[PDB]
Amino acid sequence: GFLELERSSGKLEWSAILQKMASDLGFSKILFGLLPKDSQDYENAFIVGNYPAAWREHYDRAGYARVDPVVSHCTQSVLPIFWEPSIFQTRKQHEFFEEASAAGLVYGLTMPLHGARGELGWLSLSVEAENRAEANRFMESVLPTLWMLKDYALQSGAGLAF
Amino acid sequence: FLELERSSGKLEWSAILQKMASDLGFSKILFGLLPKNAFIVGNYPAAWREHYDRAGYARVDPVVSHCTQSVLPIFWEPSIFQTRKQHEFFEEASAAGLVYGLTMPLHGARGELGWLSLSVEAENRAEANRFMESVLPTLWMLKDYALQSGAGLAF
């Protein structure tokens, strides 16, 4: 239930529970990330999930936090952003998404996380599909469940992390 | 949710929100949003709102303290009113017709702080809980849509 998330008593158990939940929902790769209030110390964010390690290292080395339109969206909004080609507008954002696809991150969405004590983060989930139409159909079918999941993960994850 | 997000002014926005809450079965709502003197909409009884401020109930109401610590909803249950002041508080709320309901905390991307409170009419708490749980996934999306669009309108 969303219950065993709150009940988990360790980051490793918690991570495993959240991973299984996303997998069970039909998502492929996830990244849950959380920082405390007024922080850009991305290098020490609480990070859970199975995003490819090579992508995570590439992202940090290339300074993509400053390029990725998902990150700037999350600083402005509580609403989800789907990884639509139309959000990768500048040349640097276009190249970023090309690189993302080499790492297998082609279809997906991110839920911004904004916590009660100012925590800031994201829950990103990738979908494996034959085409974007199929991927968007799947994500829309599970979005109401995901919308609750992201706040349960935010609340319980922030308690374990900070 | 689109016509909420597309509303032109606060009065139109408030009317849409109220109707959406009624369509989910809620008779009384209060939406409040403080910036990082708040933005207030709803149809809570005016006399309750005045009493609440005058009595300084913001420092007593367990819903308020919950909202400052959590993003998860809190249902108005006896078990959350503990102190003595908190029982008197819930007794007066009953006089205003606020017996069953829940509050969704609001935490905006720009640090806005608020609440979306919704009251339901029911014969008993078990029935009220069924009513609320049956629409909670929709309410969970609504509260973030209302947060985003309301913050943009009021600030």
Binding site: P69, S72, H73, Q76, S77, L79, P80, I81, F82, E84, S86, I87, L109, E140, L143 | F1, L2, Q148
Partner: peptide
């Protein structure tokens, strides 16, 4: 319709 880009 749930896609947003701020």
């Amino acid at each position: 319709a749930h896609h947003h880009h701020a």
